[PDB]
Amino acid sequence: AIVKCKPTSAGRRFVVKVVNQELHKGAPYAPLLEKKSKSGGRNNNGRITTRHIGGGHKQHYRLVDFRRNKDGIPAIVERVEYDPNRTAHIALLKYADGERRYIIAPKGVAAGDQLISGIGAPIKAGNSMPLRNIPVGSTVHGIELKPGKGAQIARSAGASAQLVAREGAYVTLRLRSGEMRKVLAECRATLGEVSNSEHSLRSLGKAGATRWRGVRPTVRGVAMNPVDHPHGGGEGRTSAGRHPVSPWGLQTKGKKTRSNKRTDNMIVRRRK
Amino acid sequence: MKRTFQPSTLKRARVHGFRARMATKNGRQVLSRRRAKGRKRLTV
RNA sequence: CAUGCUUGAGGUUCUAACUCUGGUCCGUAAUCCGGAUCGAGGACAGUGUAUGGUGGGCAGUUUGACUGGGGCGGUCUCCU
RNA sequence: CUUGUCGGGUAAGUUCCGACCUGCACGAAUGGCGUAACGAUGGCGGCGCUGUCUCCACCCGAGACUCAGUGAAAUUGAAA
RNA sequence: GAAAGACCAAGGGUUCCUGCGCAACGUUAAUCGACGCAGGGUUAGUCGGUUCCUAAGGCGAGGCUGAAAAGCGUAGUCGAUGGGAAACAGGUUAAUAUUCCUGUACUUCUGGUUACUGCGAUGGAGGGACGGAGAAGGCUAGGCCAGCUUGGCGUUGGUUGUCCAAGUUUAAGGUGGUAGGCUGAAAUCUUAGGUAAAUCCGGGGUUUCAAGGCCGAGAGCUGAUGACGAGUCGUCUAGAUGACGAAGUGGUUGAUGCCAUGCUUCCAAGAAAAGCUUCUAAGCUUCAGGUAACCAGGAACCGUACCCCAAACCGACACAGGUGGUCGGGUAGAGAAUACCAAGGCGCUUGAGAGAACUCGGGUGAAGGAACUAGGCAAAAUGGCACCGUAACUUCGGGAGAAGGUGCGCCGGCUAGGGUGAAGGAUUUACUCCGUAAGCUCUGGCUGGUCGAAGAUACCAGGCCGCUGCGACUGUUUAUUAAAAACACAGCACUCUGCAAACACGAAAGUGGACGUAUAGGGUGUGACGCCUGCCCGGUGCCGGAAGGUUAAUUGAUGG
RNA sequence: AAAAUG
RNA sequence: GCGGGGUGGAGCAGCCUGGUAGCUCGUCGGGCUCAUAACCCGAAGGUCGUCGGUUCAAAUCCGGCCCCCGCAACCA
RNA sequence: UUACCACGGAGUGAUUCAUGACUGGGGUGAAGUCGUAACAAGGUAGCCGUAGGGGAACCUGCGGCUGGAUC
């Protein structure tokens, strides 16, 4: 539930908090955690390759099962947790033979639920099974692109895709972006959408809440000198006297940058 | 006022030391160029 | 006008070249790298070479003289 | 142009506040018009307080002054 | 005197102590010295390293890539600022001491003998193992007071006494399992799991019980008839030497230190690996190995002097500068502020005069009170606690300590409580529950008296108010003339990107983005909030279209 | 289909 | 200092390239209407700012003058 | 000498009158200017609520009413 904060301070006036009272408030499952360090946006040459990255809080990595290849054994949701490195929540499952695993929590799984997988599973939410025998018109999430590779699409909060068509050994499904893309019918998906649908109804409230997530301030190119940006220079405030452009000379107000040409045959319709 | 030289012997041996010049061929020519001048120090 | 012999252009398909930052087996005690085998794409992508376009992202430079200081203006060759 | 004109404040106000519209040459995300809280931010006005001032006077320490010791500097064509 | 005292780390390297010196060094002299000469001085199983383990990162057999040099990276092995065994009190030198000596401990290893025995990993499980803030307790160091012992009887009125001075100390360890924290326990059958196996862990079933199991400061008892202790006696040259050596106790207060890696709560969701416990695999199997008791021995190597908020380190100097962490007493005080002191340390390496102008740092000022000036710059003024009271406006939080006002010292009378706490009582008969007079300590209330010019009496300790421009606010910025209206910001919008993502660094391999997946990632402009954001696609960009016109390498008909 | 006023 | 203009009552073509002044509104006269407006038909109306010059011929070329409108007037 | 207390002072609010540059509409007045919104089916049937636009009456969208003409 979203909670609006009282204007007790100048930095609490516009804070809208997403608070869920049903998340687990103990400790995460230790056997499925490993360390991860920050990079600052620097590659192995030590140079900044992606800017406005740095700082934040220490985090652990949670081994989330994106494959979901225990076909047949029924599971049971044991708790829904917080993940520092998603925007969705995660569900800890206990199978009929120990073997606890993390998955991405669907929209309405709390403490029971079976969440079986494989061919022949029911059509309830949270069940995983190949795209071939998912009824046409239903919504899916966590779609994988290569068999055995793991889920790639529809993974953030409240995300979903819809199965539109099916013919041959391919299925066509409409992505959250508005794009029609054909996917192999051998690949797997999960029914329903992703939890934490209200993630978008939040307000950070202050400059310090951006830094808690590891994001550094963004200077705008007009506030620079000609040596630093194509937009910089001029006496007084100027409006970037040329057509708006990237720091490295690429136009950004409308120019298309896709140049794949290998996977064009899997794009039925563009997003735009 | 803080001055530029703040001494430390661990950071002195790891940057200018003998085993740091012999790691790369560019530092192995500093040593040869100093053995030819006739230097007595030859390494930090 | 079917034909037989060739080549130009396009579409469709197949696998056997190439591709895989997909699975499992071995080297092996190893999310590298090789080999084997499944799976997908497939003569496409990609790279070499030749070529048209774009390209201040980057570079080497030029941007005249007279002048009651320089600039602005005017003048710069020939005839009475 | 310009200290535009009118009103307020002051004994007297090229600054300040409220208006007019003749906008040399405002104007709507190089955002337009307002706005509580905030500011070692710009302008103006009050109360208290005062050596800021009329106009300076006395007093207390450290130099300056004399004695003993050590002992520089910039500069310099030559100087009756 | 929250250092200008004491101690660690870095850094320095003989500056440490003694004997002999004054040429030079020391901003003066020097008999002195961090100066010259010559000797001396640093003692470890437990302190710090090394050996064991890893983080960021480095190197990197093969490998991939690259004109050459070389780049990246797998296995691996280096890398603390972190993890992981164990010692304290007293004495002692001119110079060392948790090291030497005395006394009392603790950890670990080796070789034997006996007795019983399934041993075995690099692999599996457990454990190590952890955030911000807050709060209620328990305790300890430390501090005070009383009593006790020893000495004193005061150059000037009184001082044989509810008088004055000093001391009233004692660790590690062992025993103890307390305040308190966490957890259900045992037996039996079984298994889509932990890459193979497992009696270990995870999962499932049945039976029984309300009691076990792990942590945990601290008190007390002992260590300790011992050490220490004012001082006294003997011996010697004013100081050394040996022996003896009094009291050594209770009550209150109480930490920012320990219980506490605990408990509650909130999002920003809070290191790894080894040491450690346990299970089996390959191998032995009557050797090996393991488990207990006893006996005998061992713990190697390196650093230990001195400065260390500075005259010894970084600044050319014996330089108003800079330098990480620990301790930190008394009286006032909320306080680690401030004032006066303790322990301890110092008076800052030129002086002596005299008392001109002028300069620097201050004190007081008649009448006036900003008339000064670019401008109230500077100065003056306000300043604490309790109580009363307080405007426009507002995003309902605020503005607000708005503004303004009253009381405050000391000495008595009466009076209401809290905390600790003998005797007593109870049964959980003992590290226990309830509760108590005296004493000690902490909060008040109403009622007088009294001194001064003035009682928050010194140090310390907000000046306030009314209109406006700008930027919403906290924050950042030109090290060394600009701290702002500039940058950032939360919020808004446009646009690109379907994952081997766009994009960026790399002749390339590769890496970041991201172990993320359109509620996500990059670029661009604007900049909380409220009301809004109007017309123009002619120019230049971008997006889409494919008909026609032009149009490169290439090909080579024809002609000469 | 156009059709204002006095 | 440089540049562009002055044409019926009003606002705009004609000036390039010398020989022919045009468009809309307005004005006048007659129509339709009970009357005005709107609408229809027919006419008038500018020797081209002024002077001077070349030319057979100047709104048109070349000069001065009087009127306007734009820029520029900078470094100390 | 203390207690009560009038005059008089200090700070800060509320309320009510007079006035104020400049501005918003209202009413009245004459042979003024622009159009013609309503009254007939007033020549696009009018009114009500609401929103946007425009020299002005007013126009347009959404819903409602008949207090609408012809058959």
Ligand SMILES: [Mg+2]
């Ligand atoms: Mg960014």
Ligand SMILES: [Mg+2]
């Ligand atoms: Mg993240």
Ligand SMILES: [Mg+2]
């Ligand atoms: Mg920005």
Ligand SMILES: [Mg+2]
């Ligand atoms: Mg931004």
Ligand SMILES: [Mg+2]
């Ligand atoms: Mg930007």
Ligand SMILES: [Mg+2]
């Ligand atoms: Mg700027």
Ligand SMILES: [Mg+2]
């Ligand atoms: Mg700038």
Ligand SMILES: [Mg+2]
């Ligand atoms: Mg740069």
Ligand SMILES: [Mg+2]
């Ligand atoms: Mg540029």
Ligand SMILES: [Mg+2]
């Ligand atoms: Mg400007």
Ligand SMILES: [Mg+2]
């Ligand atoms: Mg600029």
Ligand SMILES: [Mg+2]
């Ligand atoms: Mg510009």
Ligand SMILES: [Mg+2]
């Ligand atoms: Mg370095």
Ligand SMILES: [Mg+2]
């Ligand atoms: Mg050197």
Ligand SMILES: [Mg+2]
């Ligand atoms: Mg095939």
Ligand SMILES: [Mg+2]
């Ligand atoms: Mg990748």
